[PDB]
Every structure is written in C-alpha cells, then in structure tokens.
Curated annotation (Swiss-Prot), chains A, B:
Keyword Oxidoreductase belongs to the record: yes
InterPro entries documented for this protein: Catalase_peroxidase (IPR000763), Haem_peroxidase (IPR002016), Haem_peroxidase_sf (IPR010255), Peroxidases_AS (IPR019794), Peroxidases_heam-ligand_BS (IPR019793)
Gene name linked to the record: katG
Designated name of the protein: Catalase-peroxidase
Top enzyme class: oxidoreductase
GO molecular function: catalase activity; heme binding; metal ion binding
Keyword RNA-binding: no
Family: Belongs to the peroxidase family. Peroxidase/catalase subfamily.
C-alpha cells in the first residue's frame, strides 16, 4: 500500500498536530476526567490492588508469590520514558499501553502486568485512568512490601492513540552504537532529545555500554541518561538501589525461545507477546531481559540488603543461562531465595549497572552514605519515586485526590497561592490604558507576552506565563528573549504595577505575571486598532509571581528555545530543518495546523521577530494586525530564490522587474510550499478573510496566554 | 525518525478513520459551504474566468493566447481519478491540490493551471471551494470556446488534508507492468479497486500499453479503465474526442530537463514543480508529458476537426523531440497552427490512444457516427462531461446553484420527489408497535435495516436506504442480504404499509424505504427493552421508493458488499486480511474507530450476522442490546486458538477446563488484539458502561440510517 510518507519521506508531517481529536476519543466531548476521578473511592481501589499483589494467575505466576516487583518495574517503565529536552514520554498519558512502547524490548512482559490490572480497571471504569492506575499500582506494590510512599496524585487523563514521538532513527531494535543511524557521535554524545542509549531501552543497557560489562563506563551512561530524565546523582542512586531492593530479573533459558513482541504477534495472542517456547514459558522458566539476578535475601520486603550486598562482597563476572553478562558474589553462601522452589537458594548477584553505584567515584560516596544511614536512603527514594512518577503532571493545581503531598518541591516550578482580591474588568481597562500611554510599542508588548507564555509545553505541562519567571534567571537572559529590550519593558511594567498597587484599597493588587499578559493584550488591541478593527482581547487574572528561590535555574535550561519559528529564531545551524522545528514547537504548544498558521502570520506583522528581523515581515503596515503576511506570501507576482550567502534565507523579487520585495526563512516560506499549509494560508489570504483572520488570531493568542492556567480548569 | 508503520508495516492503520477532524479545518465548526455558495454571484465568477482565459501570464504563457485546453485537462484530471469499485477519487473533494495527486506525473504542470486560478479564488474566498472552481473553470473554458455545456452544480466542500487512498503497491512512478508489485495478473487483469494502468496515470499510457504503440491493444486498456470509471464505449469516445478537440500536448525537448515534482521540489518553488532547464522552460519550450501533438486546426474553438483529421489522413509512427511515440499524418500539409509563432504551421498529429478510436472496431462505429453527425457528438460529450465531473457528488439534493440541469439521469440513482404529508411521531410509534406485533424478530428487523442502509459510501455518496432499492434487482439477490429471509421480511413490511396507508385521511402515507428503517429502529428499541433499557431510537421520515426502471442494475453491482465485517461476512477468500476490509468499510461509512467498535459489538449481539453465524456472538442473551460482546471478548479466563479446519476462525476455551465457550473470526478478535481497538473495547466492557454503550449504539445506528439523507442537510 504505497503512501505519501513512501514517496516524500522528508516532507513535513502535519498529522502530529491533529492527533487526539474528538473523532478517536470514545468519551463524550463533555467527559471531564478530573471530575470522574474526584468521585472514585480511591481507598477501595487500593484495597483491590493490595489483594491483587498475592493473587497469582497460572498464565503468569507470581515470583515469590507476590507481583510487587513486577508492578514496580511496570510503573518505573511507564514513568521512565520521560526526556527533559522536550518533556515527551513519561507516565502522564498511559502511553505504555500503545505502540511502540507496549512492544519495546525493555517493556517485555509488562503486557502481563497490565493484563493482571484489567479486572480492577474494568471494575472502576472511567473513574480511574490506565495512566493513573499504572502509577498507583506501583505505589501499592511498595506499600504492600513495607515501604511508605511520599504520596500520590491522580489526574492523568487517558489518551486514545499513540503519541508521535521521535525515539530515534535506528531501524533495528536495540542497535548498538555507531550504525548508519547512530544516536551517538563525538565522545559518546547522545543526540538531543533522546534519553536512552539504544532503541527500545528505558535508560541504559544492564550488561554495560553496547554490551561491554564495565561498571565504570556504565556509570557514565547512567549519569547522562538519568540527567536527561531530570534526575541528579543522589536521586539516581536512590532510585536504582531502591528499585533493585525488590524482585528479580528473568533469564532462565536462551532468548531464541522468545517470540514476537505484542504488536507483531498473532491475533489469537489477544494483545500479549513474547510467548516463550522455553519449558513452561513462564514462572520459574520466565525469560524477560535474559539476565538472571535476584538482589536481596527478602525480594518481597523492603530491606537494607541491597547496599549490604553491594559493599559486602567482591564481584565476579559470569553469565546468565541466556548468555548475558552479570555478576556473582565471590565465595558467598547461597542466601538468596528462589522464586518458586523453597528448597533452592542462590548466591548474591548484581547487574553491571548496579556495580556502577559502587565503582563510580561520585556514586560510591552516595551509596556509602545510604548504606551507613538507611533512613536517608529511604527518604531519598521516596522523594525520587514521587518525582519520577509525577514529573510530567504539571502544576500542583492538576493534582487530585486525598494523598497529594502537602510539601511543595522545587522541581514542581511552584507558584504562590493568590491571597488578595484580583483585578476586575475596570482595573484591566485602566492598566491597559496606562500601558499604552507609557510609550511601549505593539512590538515590545507582543514580543514580551509571547516570550513569557510560549515556554509552555503540553508534553510535561511545564512553563507558561504564570509565575513571571521571564523576569528571573535564566529566562531573563535567554537570547531569544532579547535581554536588553526585555529589561526595558519589564522596568516600565514594574513602575506601572507599583503605582497601581500603591493606589489600592483593601489588599487588591496585580501580579507582574498578570500584567505582562495584560500588557500583551493591550498591544494586540492597539495593533487591531492600527488596522481599523475594534477588538477587545480576553484576559483572565490570577497568575502569581514566583521568586528566584522557587525557580531551579538548571531545570529551567531545558525550556530555552533554541528554535522558535514564531519569532523567526534559530540559535544555531541544526541538522533538523527549521520547518520541522516549527511543527515540533506547535505540537508542544497544543496548536493545530490552522492555529499555528494564523498565529505565525499575525506575529510576523506585529513585530515579534527576534532582533527586529525583516524576514517574513510581508507588510508595509508593521504593528497593525492584518492578514498581509498571507496575501503577500501567496502573490505570484513574486519569485523566490535562496540567497548566495545562505541556502536558508530567500529573496523574493518582482517577477517582471527583478526588484527585491522581501526576504524570508524556511519557516516563512514553508507556508507557501507545503500543500496543506498553503491551503490554510489561502483561507486567511482571501479577500473575505480580514475579520476572520483578526478573530482567529485573537482566539489563538488568548489560548497561548492561558496554556498553563490549570487554576481555572 | 522510525515510526510504528516502519516497525509493524502490516498492523492496521486506524488514522484513516480519524482524518477530517475539526482540528485540521480552518473554517468555524459552524461553516456551511452550501449556504456560502448559494449566495455566490456565480455569473460574476464566470465573467472573471472568461477574462482569465485569454489573459496570458509570462510565468506560464498561454498556448495560442488561450488557457482553455489547459483548464479542460485540469478539470478532466480532477474528475478522472474516480474508481467505481470504491467510489474513491473524483473531483468532489478538490484532492488534486494535495499529495499525492498534485505530484502525479499525469498531473504535470496542472500546478500552473491551479496557480492561475488563485486570484479568482482569493477574490471570492469561501463562497466557492477549490473543488467547485476546478470544475467550473473547465466548464467556462468549454463555453468560451463555443461549446454548450449540459450544466453545473456547486456544492463540493473543500477538504483540508490528503485522503488515504490505495492507488497501487508500486514503489516507482509509472512502473511498467509485471514488476514485484504488478497491478496486473493473468491475461492483463487489473486488480480491484485500481482504475489506471500504471502508478501515477489517470487512465492509460498515451504511447500505448507499457509504452507499446499499438492502438488496438491500447483500446483494450482504454475500455477497461474507462469502464472502471463508470464510462461505457459511447461516453468514452465522446470524452476523448471531445477533450482532444482542444489545446495541445507539450514535449519540446528531452524529459531529462524536467526537475522534481511539487512534493519533492525545493521550498522556493512555492508549491510548483517540474521546473524545466529546457530553453525558456515554458511556453513554446514547454515540456509536460514529453509528447508533441496538436490535434486540430483551431485548438481554441469547438469544431469537428478531431474526427476529420482522424478519418481524413493515414498515420505514421514517429517520435516527439523528447523521444515519445506519437503519430503524424502522412503527406499532409502544414495546416495546424503553432502555439506562439504566427508564421509557423505543422502537420496533424495524434496519440496512439487517439487512433484507438478509429482502429478498435467497436469504437470505430461510434467515432464514425460522431464524425458524420457532430451534433450527436456535441450532445454525447456534453452529457459525458457532466457525468464525469459530477459522478461523485451524490444525490441531486446536494446540487446547488442556478445551472443545475433539470433532466434526471439514470446514473444519478434518482429518488422521486415526496408529494404527500409525512408520518409524525405518533404514526411512527404505531408503525413500530405493528412491526413488533407482526412477529418479525429483533434479528430480522436489524439485519434488514442494516442491509438497506449500509450500502452507503461517502467516497461518492452513492447507496443508502433512501429509494428502497433493497427490494429491487440486484440488491434483493445479493448473498450478503440473505435473499429468502429478506423477501419474507419485506413482504410482511409491505402488508403493514398497505394497511397503514389504506387507513389514512388526507393523503398521508409512508414509503417502504422509510418503513424498512423505522422497522430497524423498532428492532433496536425492542433489543434495548429486552436488556431492561427504555430508549427511543430517533427516526426521520422523507425517504421515497425508486422504481426498477430508475435503477441501473449494472451500476448497482459495484455496491455489492463482498466483505462486511459488521455482519461477519466475507464472500470469498481474499489476499487482504478481513480486519483491513473492516476498516475499509468503516471508512466508507464515515465511522470513527469508536463508532465502528460500538456498532460492531452491538450488531453481533443483536443477531445481524449473515446465515445466523454464532461467530462473535459473545452473549447468552442474544437479541438483547448489551455490551456482552466486549465483556466476554476481554475476559482473560478465555484462551483463543486458530482452528484445525480454518486459520481465520478461532476457538475460545475456558483456560482452566478446556471447555469450548465461543467461536470468532479475525474481525471479531481484532478488537481484543489491536492495541488501539482493545483500548476502545475496554471502555465499553467496563462495569460502568452499559448505559453509555446503549446511548452510543443508538447514535451510531441512527447515523448510519441517515447517511444518504442530504434532503435534510
Ligand atoms: C540503571 C537503571 C536500571 C537498569 C539498567 C535496570 C535494569 C533492569 C533489568 C534488566 C531488570 C530485569 C528485567 C527482567 O528480566 O524481568 C530490572 C528489574 C527491575 N527493576 Fe530495574 N533497572 C534500572 C533501574 C530501575 C529503577 C529506577 C527502578 C525502580 C525504582 C527499577 C526497579 C526494578 C524492579 C522492581 C525490577 C524487578 C522486576 C520483577 O520483579 O519482575 N529498576 N531492572
Ligand atoms: C485515453 C484517454 C486519454 C489520454 C491518454 C490522454 C492523454 C493526453 C496527453 C498525454 C496530453 C498531453 C499533456 C501535455 O503534454 O500537456 C493530453 C492533453 C489533453 N487532454 Fe487528454 N487524454 C485522454 C483523455 C482526455 C479526456 C477524457 C479529456 C477531456 C474531456 C482530455 C483533454 C485533454 C486536453 C484539453 C488536453 C490539452 C492540454 C493543454 O492544451 O494544455 N483528454 N491528453
Ligand atoms: N508527544 N506529545 C506532545 O508533543 C504533547 C502532548 C500533550 N500536549 C502537548 C504536546
Ligand atoms: N478516500 N475517501 C473515503 O473513503 C471517504 C471520503 C469521504 N467520506 C467518506 C469516505
Ligand atoms: Cl509522549
Ligand atoms: Cl478520495
Ligand atoms: Na510527556
Ligand atoms: Na470519491
């Protein structure tokens, strides 16, 4: 069946902006997951999950009689696809149940784990999503086995189709580095935005880098991949040691026994995969990773035995029954219990990646401290497990149910509670007039508010204008934000705010976060008036100002835009074409193709480009809100060519005279090239479309201003 | 970027059901194209188009000073992708402007024709769709050159993304037959549903079959492909002769001069392609097909010179400047004008496929009659051109504006006007009660109404329950429709109708087409009652009964379902998996994945399977409307295996006892295998879902009942 993707594999794919339509969603347009979850009897759900832990099913018998380890690994993998670079992956959409993650090699047999949860899912129905259930089940596993969690928030709404995520370019599962589509270059540099060492792994290879069983080298990969999942050294050691306090791995026989992954299995397998011809195919004969390691003397109970073993023995390199590299404790007694046979015991074993916690010098010091102070280990793991499993849930206002921790954590980019009356519509009109009387231009007001709001990404629900973090390090210094002009605009807004707030009775005040947005609205109003349209822009108050100490500077670096097509900004020269980067950004902002089109066309004419660039400013009435961008872009009286100096900048000349009319980047011209985008630009560039352009612009502007406003949801 | 399609190339692609969401649509959800078109000043549009015809642009100079020929070929190609086998292709969605059709080799330089129309599109905006404008432009071309068209209907709403259409399996444009993905097998049998001889052609190869310049052989491809586009011999000769009365081909130099098709061209080309390094690249130097033929002495005026030349000279095999086979008149004077140089003239030329009209014996008699009687030629062509360009527009109720022809054509599957009062809601309740008192079962009433309504396909908007054609040849004899049971149900319904209609005052009556649907509604209400739910199934009267004499039997053959997963029906053994056929049918019925899921699950338990098969009937309360399908499908207590006798039927056995519980086909079990479908099935199989399943079933049943009801749009 030959498709457009086969004929034109490097054309832009806009379908990624149109996933998650109401067409694929089986719930009404009215279904609100938060409200269904708020009625769930969470306690009853936890009781059922507690019972499930030791209700072994014959089609996938429970190791040691307890599914706890399996469910902790299930939950860890649901969370563990998260990348800080784009905020994609993570547990927040329940994507583990869809392709490709349902069939990743590292997710082998987690199909069985999710099938075990079906009766509970079915019983509670829409009131608990798969996405919430997977994490809750991890929590309950930990609790069942004697570990007290830091807490749990519901509110991860289920999704209904696979996300479009760049997981790499390799065409072979688990391909080792240096192939034709290598994710590594230079001195083992992993390409952004990837956060795993091989296609179909979560973070690293348990045998060591590219299969080489060097724990020191393995530590380097661990540290890099975990940093790319937002975890520092302490959190990392706590998570790995904490997780490998429980359960075991499965490699009872050769991996050639294991058949097709779920998405490749036959229809009779009913959504399950990795069927094994080794012996009974399950239980004591299970093959998952190929490794055969049990870490502790009590695999179904919280202990301090991980670090006791890690430091208490010396380790020797050996092989699992499947042929995989792993480590066995030299001269040890058989103290580890067998998962199925009460008469067999085994020597302590470890993976290469466990030994990393000992033999990397920085990890070693943390592992020692946790060894000597187990209460610090327990607390670090609890905190890290909460972080891991909630990292992509967004602001605290989205957290539901009775187990939400009251402690506010730095990584949540917290926003202070509003404790005063908010501005009303009269106050908003007075502020907007003061803004316009101060001398700030349309371009300044629009650029500033765009800069503040457009850090939001729906992937992990970080960023947005709430908080006024654009006035703090590091946002205030980002090149795309034009630090010098930004400083000037903020100093003017701050004087307006000080004066308005000092005039108030009764505790009313306006936050700078609100005023930045409100000021951008005034700029759009002014621009509409410059074009002869009478427009009021909607504005919702209630944003607050976060302090510098509430803003982790390092964590904030990943939100820096290195490409923002909306401002015609590229930080350097990338191997990814700019128009691909524009679509990627539109996706993070939750924009459809029509929204992205109208938005960019308006921003160009309002003066939002970085550095006052003229590229794509296809108008003679800059700072007026018109559809000029489109009308001029589509004018066949102009011919375009890439410039001598740069293949990425284009000159548009009068076809008859050869005179230069405009210049543009690939981001500008793509709207006139791509057949679906051009169809959109046409709508907005038609003679009957001036009002529609202004109205659709206002609506999309307001949408971007409100992206993070979960306090109103 | 490696995708799910790369890893699992034979998994089902559900995205095809979720195109044309509101997300991709730049118009408000309120936009009604029909109402915008009805206020268009169509006369003013045709005046602008008329002026455009002879206003040559230097970027693509008009041959002979007139764009007419170019626009006729543009409109012919817009329409000429149509296939009767699935109704896909055609002009009715304006898909020529999107991938892949925008870049087919046969559509070369029609990018220039569409660009020429941009000023007029831009002037009239949303009041005329691209889809309508392409056809109108061809009409105006013909009119400006002296040809009287049979009429024009507007109402083709624009679309905003490529359709997913199977155009063949070849991986090389224009691949010759007999390759690894050959569309031909046996004695030159073209695979259904294809209607062109090579990938990226409209119908046939202008040089002859696989490039072999034998007009006799070419005539066989012409006849086959045109029949597959719903054209008989007379229509075919009229179309080809009629078209090639105008304009010329373009092959001024070697084809190697011609660059990338639009979807492959650089961003600077702004949506145009096939840029030519040959001399000026355009005009007198134009290269399109590679052939260099001008058919008549007045290429910008309607004439009967095509047939005068065809019969008046003898023809010699020759080559264009690009190397293509074509024919030149032996010993002729230079009587054909040059497109750009008034001092240069040329001999008559023909394509191999033109000579087919003379040298095929059946075409020859038609071409002679048209030769001797050009008034018959003009009338046949007018009629054929109307048919061609409207074939996929659907019922007459969708035809808009002031040039709709009053004559009703058999190919339109016409439906008589309703001339009497319609039944009201109390009448509908009395009819439903009489239906249920007659002893027709839930199963019979549902099967019958499904059989009648489910012939509809949104691709060409043919079929549906309006007309009561299920009582007529050939529908009454299709094996899927269970002819003997159908006859029994219809006889009972007809006696109820005769008695209701005989009791009325005031000319009120009910059509059998309405009653068949209404009776299906009664079946579903009774099924819901059997499960303890009281619902009313909505019903809209106003269908009418068409006669046998108003039903072209041969044209109706292509609507026969050979695969209907909704009735668990497959007519024979196909190369395509049945679950793929199910998705194909869902797409033709305009169903989303959730609608297809709910609908199939309900139809199973209502007894809609052909032949009373138990396959997929996963309930112990058949004829009760419950969600049993899903609850039992998803029960992990049952294990499934393909049967000894058949790899396409499966047995479901109790996992503990080995007892046989159910049987199912691939269509049944796909809902428990495919990860996106199983996520849907889960919603409907959850303990809180019984009411939602009934509500969603009823809505989708009603939707299918109404698919053809453009009289209410
Ligand atoms: C360097 C990072 C990590 C590596 C390379 C790694 C590797 C593995 C491997 C290969 C398995 C065996 C899979 C099998 O054959 O069944 C496994 C099991 C497991 N891991 Fe990890 N792991 C890592 C981090 C984590 C973390 C962060 C957690 C949780 C906080 C976790 C919890 C588990 C648990 C509970 C199991 C046991 C599964 C069972 O009992 O069925 N691991 N790990
Ligand atoms: C067996 C069927 C047909 C074949 C193989 C065929 C082939 C061709 C070819 C190869 C060209 C030249 C393209 C170029 O180099 O610019 C052409 C031109 C043309 N064809 Fe057809 N054609 C067929 C049927 C039709 C029909 C059904 C129509 C309309 C009723 C039509 C109308 C035209 C016109 C108007 C042109 C002139 C283009 C211009 O003046 O720029 N043809 N045809
Ligand atoms: N792959 N996922 C995203 O790009 C995304 C998800 C949710 N909202 C916005 C963006
Ligand atoms: N390829 N196109 C179709 O299958 C279709 C188009 C419009 N409505 C329904 C089905
Ligand atoms: Cl994602
Ligand atoms: Cl189509
Ligand atoms: Na995410
Ligand atoms: Na069609």
């Amino acid at each position: 069946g030959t498709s457009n993707r086969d004929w034109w594999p490097n054309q832009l794919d806009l379908s990624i902006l149109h996933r998650h339509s109401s067409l694929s969603d089986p719930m009404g347009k009215d279904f609100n997951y938060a409200q269904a979850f708020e009625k769930l009897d969470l306690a009853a759900v936890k009781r059922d999950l507690h019972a499930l832990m030791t209700t072994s099913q014959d089609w996938w018998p429970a190791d040691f009689g307890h599914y706890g380890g399996l469910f902790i690994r299930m939950a860890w993998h649901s969370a563990g696809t998260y990348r800080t670079a784009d905020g994609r992956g993570g547990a927040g959409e329940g994507q583990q149940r869809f392709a490709p993650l349902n069939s990743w090699p590292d997710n082998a047999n987690l199909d069985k784990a999710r099938r075990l949860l079906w009766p509970i899912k079915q019983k509670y129905g829409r009131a608990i999503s798969w996405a919430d259930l997977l994490i809750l089940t991890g929590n309950v596993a930990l609790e069942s086995m004697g570990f007290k969690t830091f807490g749990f928030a519901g509110g991860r709404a289920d999704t209904w189709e696979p996300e479009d995520v760049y997981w790499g370019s390799e065409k072979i599962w688990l391909e080792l580095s240096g192939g034709p589509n290598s994710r590594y270059s230079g001195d083992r540099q992993l390409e952004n935005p990837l956060a795993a060492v091989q296609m179909g792994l979560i973070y690293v290879n348990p045998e060591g880098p590219d299969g080489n069983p060097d724990p020191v080298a393995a530590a380097r990969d661990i540290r890099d991949t975990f940093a790319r999942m937002a975890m520092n050294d302490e959190e990392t050691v706590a998570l790995i040691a904490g997780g490998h306090t429980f359960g075991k791995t499965h490699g009872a026989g050769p991996a050639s026994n294991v058949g097709a992954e779920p998405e490749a299995a036959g229809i009779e397998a009913q959504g399950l995969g990795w069927k094994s011809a080794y012996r009974t195919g399950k239980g004591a004969d299970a093959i998952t990773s190929g490794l055969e390691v049990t870490w502790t003397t009590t695999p179904t109970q919280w202990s301090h035995n991980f670090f006791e073993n890690l430091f208490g023995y010396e380790w020797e390199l050996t092989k699992s029954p499947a042929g995989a590299h792993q480590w066995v404790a030299k001269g040890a007694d058989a103290v580890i219990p067998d998962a199925f046979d009460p008469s067999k015991k085994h020597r302590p074993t470890m993976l290469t990646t466990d030994l990393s916690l000992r033999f990397d010098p920085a990890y070693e010091k943390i592992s020692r401290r946790f060894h000597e102070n187990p209460e610090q280990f327990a607390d670090a793991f609890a905190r890290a497990w909460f972080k891991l499993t909630h990292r992509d849930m967004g602001p605290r206002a989205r957290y539901l149910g009775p187990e939400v921790p009251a402690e506010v954590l730095l990584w949540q980019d917290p926003i202070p509670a509003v404790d005063h009356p908010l501005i009303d519509a009269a106050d908003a009109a007075e502020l907007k007039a003061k803004v316009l009387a101060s001398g700030l231009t349309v371009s300044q007001l629009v650029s500033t508010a765009w800069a503040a709001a457009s850090t939001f990404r729906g992937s992990d629900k970080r960023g947005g204008a709430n908080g006024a973090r654009i006035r703090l390090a590091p946002q205030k210094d980002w090149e795309a934000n034009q630090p010098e002009q930004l400083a000037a605009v903020l100093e003017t807004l701050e004087a307006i705010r000080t004066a308005f707030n000092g005039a108030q009775r009764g505790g009313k005040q306006v936050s700078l976060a609100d005023l930045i947005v409100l000021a951008g609205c005034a700029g759009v109003e002014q621009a509409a008036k410059n074009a002869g349209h009478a427009v009021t822009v909607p504005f919702a108050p209630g944003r607050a100002d976060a302090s510098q100490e509430q803003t982790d500077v390092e964590s904030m670096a990943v939100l820096e835009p290195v490409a923002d097509g909306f401002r015609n900004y590229l930080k350097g020269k990338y191997r990814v074409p700019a128009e691909v980067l524009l679509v990627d950004k539109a996706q993070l902002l939750t924009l459809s193709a029509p929204e992205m089109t109208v938005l960019l066309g308006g921003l160009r004419v309002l003066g939002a480009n970085v550095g006052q660039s003229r590229h794509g400013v296809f108008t003679a009435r800059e700072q007026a809100l018109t559809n000029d961008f489109f009308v001029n872009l589509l004018d066949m009286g102009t011919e375009w060519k890439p410039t001598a100096a740069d293949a990425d900048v284009f000159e548009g000349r009068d076809r008859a005279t050869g005179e230069l009319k405009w210049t543009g980047t690939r981001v500008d011209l793509v709207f006139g090239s791509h057949s679906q985008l051009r169809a959109l630009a046409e709508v907005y560039g038609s003679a009957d479309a001036q009002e529609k352009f202004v109205r659709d612009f206002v609506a999309v502007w307001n949408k971007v201003m409100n992206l993070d406003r979960f306090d109103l949801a």
